[PDB]
Amino acid sequence: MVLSEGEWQLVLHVWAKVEADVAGHGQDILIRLFKSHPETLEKFDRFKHLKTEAEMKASEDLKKHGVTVLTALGAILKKKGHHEAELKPLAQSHATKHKIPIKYLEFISEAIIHVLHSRHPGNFGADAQGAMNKALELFRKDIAAKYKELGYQG
Ligand code: HEM
């Protein structure tokens, strides 16, 4: 797939608003993910034990990780499709060390779209959501292909 420059503009316009508070958007997205699909939380030896949303909000460790994740995703989106290099180390660790199925990447995509919708309704109308969905589908397809090359394709 290939996004047009107008679609990347819609994606990087909302992302510029997310960057005003990377730690708060990280926390909202990871919590939405763990709450909606609790099986994803098991993948984290570090956070598994958290029982409620209040516990999740108070974890400084979970908030730091959410900044790591959003920074890595932000550097991929700013490449506008030319992300081959950034994707390599990400795909290798998530397919070999953490073992994350493609279906869990769909679950966090949904979580990102839910939080942008709530926090940025003015900059995330239908056309901008369609461009963000296209940018994440592109990311998942390129990661799926690398998984296969690495021997996991999950
Ligand atoms: C937006 C998609 C995602 C991005 C950009 C991302 C990014 C990262 C980054 C940068 C790290 C640190 C370095 C690394 O180990 O490679 C990380 C670690 C990790 N990721 Fe992801 N990730 C994504 C999706 C997920 C999902 C959906 C799961 C599981 C449901 C997952 C599970 C893990 C685990 C278990 C670690 C290790 C955390 C720790 O103990 O250090 N990732 N991720």
Curated annotation (Swiss-Prot):
> Would you kindly state one Gene Ontology biological process term found in this protein's UniProt entry?
removal of superoxide radicals
> Which reaction(s) does the protein catalyse, per the Swiss-Prot or TrEMBL entry?
Fe(III)-heme b-[protein] + nitric oxide + H2O = Fe(II)-heme b-[protein] + nitrite + 2 H(+); H2O2 + AH2 = A + 2 H2O
Q: Which PROSITE patterns match?
A: GLOBIN
Domain (Globin): residue spans on this chain? 2-148
Q: What is its main location?
A: cytoplasm
GO CC terms in record: extracellular exosome; sarcoplasm
**Annotated EC:** 1.7.-.-, 1.11.1.-
Look up the domain of life of the source: Eukaryota
Q: Where in the cell is it found?
A: Cytoplasm, Sarcoplasm
Q: Which residues bind nitrite?
A: 65
The PTM Phosphothreonine maps to: 68
At which positions is O2 bound? 65
The answer to whether UniProt assigns keyword Membrane to this entry is no
Instruction: List modified residues, type Phosphoserine.
Output: 4
Q: Which InterPro entries match?
A: Globin, Globin-like_sf, Myoglobin
Q: Which residues bind heme b?
A: 94
Q: Output the Gene Ontology terms for molecular function.
A: heme binding; metal ion binding; nitrite reductase activity; oxygen binding; oxygen carrier activity; peroxidase activity
**Role noted for this protein:** Monomeric heme protein which primary function is to store oxygen and facilitate its diffusion within muscle tissues. Reversibly binds oxygen through a pentacoordinated heme iron and enables its timely and efficient release as needed during periods of heightened demand. Depending on the oxidative conditions of tissues and cells, and in addition to its ability to bind oxygen, it also has a nitrite reductase activity whereby it regulates the production of bioactive nitric oxide.
| Subunit structure comment from the entry | Monomeric.
Q: What is the protein's given name?
A: Myoglobin
Say which species the protein is native to.
Physeter macrocephalus (Sperm whale)
* Phylogenetic lineage: Eukaryota, Metazoa, Chordata, Craniata, Vertebrata
